Amino acid sequence: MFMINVLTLIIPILLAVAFLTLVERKVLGYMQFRKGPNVVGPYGLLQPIADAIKLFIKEPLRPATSSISMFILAPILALTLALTMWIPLPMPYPLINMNLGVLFMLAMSSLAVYSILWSGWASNSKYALIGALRAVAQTISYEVTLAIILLSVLLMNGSFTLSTLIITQEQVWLIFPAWPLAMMWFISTLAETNRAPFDLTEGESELVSGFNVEYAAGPFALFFMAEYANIIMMNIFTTTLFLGAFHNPYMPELYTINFTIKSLLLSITFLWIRASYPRFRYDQLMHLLWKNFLPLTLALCMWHVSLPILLSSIPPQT
């Protein structure tokens, strides 16, 4: 019964990754004024299976790793984190209801970078090293800021439960009480994934994803997996945190529907932002975070420490 629950959670996020990649290719296609894949199956529904079994079957391809340990560690870690992140996300019901919750997601999201340190470490290519160190740097710098945001927007919940969030949302979406901090936290969600503008790239550039996206073949179908699945997550955790629907018990699938729709549309907006804008150069990015985001986050935060005591509504910890 319980392993049934686990399987029903984790298999559909993988299928969700495949057909997500489909929707990505299409939305970018028409956004670019051209039809996406039609010629694999009808309408493009066989495209993932192509990508899937082929991209699995192309042979391992290079080089001496120098560490047999890490090379087969990092993918397992990246997946395992990407799969367990989905546990607390509320849904009508969490599948594990944790008192703390959201800071558990915050915590594992903080662990997610060892796959980049180790992945980029075992290349034996001294350039992919440097690239990896840098990607760790930007991911980590946006692990600073984001944490403070959750530590603010949550302060209108009154507890970490991640369930009571759906209780706060009943009257008004949390986007209204703070829009700006929600804006900064959206862009923050673009950060770690390194969607455009924040992505690094091919041609001439730091090429972190040059060997990172190149190397490890099938295990690149893994890093591929954890990256897209992690995307769908951060979209969902946005949908839960900064907005949400009314939960009518006796009919949970109603809230499940509405939740699903808004989340999917949000991810759609990721893929079309990536279409939309150019990339920042690296330093302008890092100290764009240090220049402006983090100070204004501090301001809004202290204003949310002082605010609820002003208006005399401070939230009811259960």
Partner 1 sequence: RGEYVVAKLDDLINWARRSSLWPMTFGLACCAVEMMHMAAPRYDMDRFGVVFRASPRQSDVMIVAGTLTNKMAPALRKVYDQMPEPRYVVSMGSCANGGGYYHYSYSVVRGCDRIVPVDIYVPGCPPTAEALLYGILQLQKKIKREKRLRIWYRR
Partner 2 sequence: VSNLTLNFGPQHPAAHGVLRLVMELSGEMVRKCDPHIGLLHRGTEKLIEYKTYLQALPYFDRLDYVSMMCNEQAYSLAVEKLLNIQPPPRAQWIRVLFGEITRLLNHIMAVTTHALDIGAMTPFFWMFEEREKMFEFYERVSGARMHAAYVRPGGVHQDLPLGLMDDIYEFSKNFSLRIDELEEMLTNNRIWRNRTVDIGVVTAEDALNYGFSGVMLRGSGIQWDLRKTQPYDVYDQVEFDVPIGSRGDCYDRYLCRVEEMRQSIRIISQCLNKMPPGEIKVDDAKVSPPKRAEMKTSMESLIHHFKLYTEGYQVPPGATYTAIEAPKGEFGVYLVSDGSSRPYRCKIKAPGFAHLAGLDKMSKGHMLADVVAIIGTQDIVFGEVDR
Partner 3 sequence: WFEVLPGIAVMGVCLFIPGMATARIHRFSNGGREKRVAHYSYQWYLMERDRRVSGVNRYYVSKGLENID
Ligand X SMILES: CCCCCCCCCCCCCCCCCC(=O)OC[C@H](COP(=O)(O)OCCN)OC(=O)CCCCCCCCCCCCCCCCC
**Binds partner 1 by CB under 8 A, chosen from 9, 23, 46, 133:** 46
The residue nearest ligand PC1 at its CB is 295
Nearer to partner 1, 173 or 224 (CB): 224
Nearer to ligand X, 36 or 274 (CB): 274
Return all residues near 49 (Cβ < 8 A) that are at least 6 apart.
18
Contacts 24+ apart (CB under 8 A), 37-46: 45/19
**DSSP secondary structure string, 130-163?**
HHHHHHHHHHHHHHHHHHHHHHHHGGGTSSS-SS
Interface with partner 3 includes 161 (CB under 8 A)? yes
93-152 binders of partner 2 (CB under 8 A)? 127
Return all residues near 110 (Cβ < 8 A) that are at least 6 apart.
143
CA distance linking residue 263 with residue 243, whole number of Å = 10
Interface with partner 1 includes 199 (CB under 8 A)? no
CA distance linking residue 168 with residue 246, whole number of Å = 10
Nearer to partner 2, 188 or 239 (CB): 188
For residues 250 and 205, the answer to whether their CB atoms sit within 8 Å is no
- Spell out a b/e string for 241-253, using b for 16 or more CB atoms within 10 Å of the CB, else e: bbbbbebeeeeee
Interface with partner 3 includes 70 (CB under 8 A)? no
Question: Minimal distance in Å, beta carbon 92 to partner 3?
Answer: 5
Which of the listed partners (ligand PC1, partner 1, partner 2, none) does 274 bind, with a CB threshold of 5 to 8 Å by partner kind?
partner 2
Interface with partner 1 includes 311 (CB under 8 A)? no
Q: What is the 3-class SS of 204-269, one letter each residue? A: CCCCHHHHHHHCCHHHHHHHHHHHHHHHHHHHHHHHHHCCCCCCCCCCHHHHHHHHHHHHHHHHHH
Question: Minimal distance in Å, beta carbon 284 to partner 2?
Answer: 7
First to last CA, the chain: 30
Interface with partner 3 includes 315 (CB under 8 A)? no
Question: Minimal distance in Å, beta carbon 217 to partner 1?
Answer: 8
Interface with ligand X includes 122 (CB under 6 A)? no
> Cis (ω within 30 of 0) for the bond into 278?
no
Which of the listed partners (ligand PC1, partner 3, partner 1, none) does 259 bind, with a CB threshold of 5 to 8 Å by partner kind?
partner 3
290-309 binders of ligand PC1 (CB under 6 A)? 295, 298-299
Interface with ligand X includes 103 (CB under 6 A)? no
Interface with ligand X includes 80 (CB under 6 A)? yes
- Contact footprint for partner 2 (CB under 8 A): 28, 31-34, 127, 196-197, 201-207, 210, 274-284
- Contact footprint for ligand X (CB under 6 A): 77, 80-81, 98-100, 104, 111, 180, 182-184, 186-187, 197, 238, 242, 273, 277, 288, 291-293, 296
